[PDB]
Amino acid sequence: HTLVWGVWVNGVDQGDGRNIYIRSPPNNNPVKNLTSPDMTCNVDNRVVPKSVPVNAGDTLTFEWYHNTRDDDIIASSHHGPIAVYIAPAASNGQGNVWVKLFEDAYNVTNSTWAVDRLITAHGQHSVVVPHVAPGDYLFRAEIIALHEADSLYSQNPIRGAQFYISCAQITINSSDDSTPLPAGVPFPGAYTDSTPGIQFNIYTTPATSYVAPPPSVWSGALGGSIAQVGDASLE
Numbered sequence: 001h002t003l004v005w006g007v008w009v010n011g012v013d014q015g016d017g018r019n020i021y022i023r024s025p026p027n028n029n030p031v032k033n034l035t036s037p038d039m040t041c042n043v044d045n046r047v048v049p050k051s052v053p054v055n056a057g058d059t060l061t062f063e064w065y066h067n068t069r070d071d072d073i074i075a076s077s078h079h080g081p082i083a084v085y086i087a088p089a090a091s092n093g094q095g096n097v098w099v100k101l102f103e104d105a106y107n108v109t110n111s112t113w114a115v116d117r118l119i120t121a122h123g124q125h126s127v128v129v130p131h132v133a134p135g136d137y138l139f140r141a142e143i144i145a146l147h148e149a150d151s152l153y154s155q156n157p158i159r160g161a162q163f164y165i166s167c168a169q170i171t172i173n174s175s176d177d178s179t180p181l182p183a184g185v186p187f188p189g190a191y192t193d194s195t196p197g198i199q200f201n202i203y204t205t206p207a208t209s210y211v212a213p214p215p216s217v218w219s220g221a222l223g224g225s226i227a228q229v230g231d232a233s234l235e
């Protein structure tokens with residue numbers, strides 16, 4: 001159970017974005033139904049009044065929280081991967097539009113999942129803004145908590161992989177469009193019951209065996225890391 005507070009750009013906090021430049025849901029409940037429109041941008045997908053200005057090559061940091069800013073972030077039980085996707089705003093996230101900019105699942109050296117590291121990072125993870133066409137975009141940050149992913153929601157609706165999905169409205173101003181955005185996958189649609197990484201038993205299967213759900217990360221990506229870029233508590 002986690003939500004996005006806002007973003008940072010190049011290490012500078014852009015301010016509370018909830019319902020402003022984040023298409024925030026009303027609470028931190030997961031989405032579980034892989035076929036639902038809620039997979040696109042969560043349960044209150046509508047245009048919000050602001051878009052954060054960035055340029056190609058900027059670092060865009062999402063900052064998550066649980067109940068209050070810079071708290072425990074997400075329950076430690078919620079081991080799983082993190083991804084970030086991009087789509088043009090004109091799509092409203094519909095159709096085959098989402099292109100993967102970042103994936104992190106399990107770090108063997110550290111023996112930690114992405115979520116574990118997100119907690120350590122005070123909720124912060126980043127991507128580098130790609131050289132796509134200037135214009136309005138949606139950046140879709142997605143945390144998959146696997147603690148009940150031994151079951152499939154479609155079979156047992158009280159269990160399943162839990163998706164914490166947040167869409168930020170981002171305007172890319174300066175970019176040479178030298179890596180134009182390639183085809184994307186749909187959400188809902190890309191993840192199905194048989195997709196690798198959706199059904200997994202984190203209690204019996206070694207974490208080193210985990211394969212996150214495709215698509216692969218786009219070659220045009222620059223991204224990205226799970227790491228604290230700024231100290232929220234100084235504000």
Ligand SMILES: *[C@@H]1O[C@H](CO)[C@@H](O)[C@H](O)[C@H]1NC(C)=O
Pocket residue numbers: 033034035036037157
């Ligand atoms: C899952 O989402 C689909 C598509 O919106 C819907 O038809 C179905 O009823 C949902 N399942 C549940 C259990 O709500």
Ligand SMILES: [Cl-]
Pocket residue numbers: none
């Ligand atoms: Cl839970």
Ligand SMILES: [Cl-]
Pocket residue numbers: 027029
């Ligand atoms: Cl609710």
Ligand SMILES: [Cl-]
Pocket residue numbers: 030
């Ligand atoms: Cl739940």
Ligand SMILES: [Cl-]
Pocket residue numbers: 030031032033036038
């Ligand atoms: Cl759901």
Ligand SMILES: [Cl-]
Pocket residue numbers: 049050051052
């Ligand atoms: Cl704006």
Ligand SMILES: [Cl-]
Pocket residue numbers: 067068069
């Ligand atoms: Cl808060």
Ligand SMILES: [Cl-]
Pocket residue numbers: 075076077078
């Ligand atoms: Cl916990």
Ligand SMILES: [Cl-]
Pocket residue numbers: 120121122226227228
């Ligand atoms: Cl960190």
Ligand SMILES: [Cl-]
Pocket residue numbers: 056131174175176177
């Ligand atoms: Cl550029």
Ligand SMILES: [Cl-]
Pocket residue numbers: 034035036188189190
């Ligand atoms: Cl679907």
Ligand SMILES: [Cl-]
Pocket residue numbers: 199200201202205
């Ligand atoms: Cl498994």
Ligand SMILES: [Cl-]
Pocket residue numbers: 105106210211212
């Ligand atoms: Cl993986």
Ligand SMILES: [Cl-]
Pocket residue numbers: 217218219220
């Ligand atoms: Cl590619």
Ligand SMILES: [Cl-]
Pocket residue numbers: 059126127128223224225
């Ligand atoms: Cl980064």
Ligand SMILES: [Cl-]
Pocket residue numbers: 229230231232234
């Ligand atoms: Cl700082």
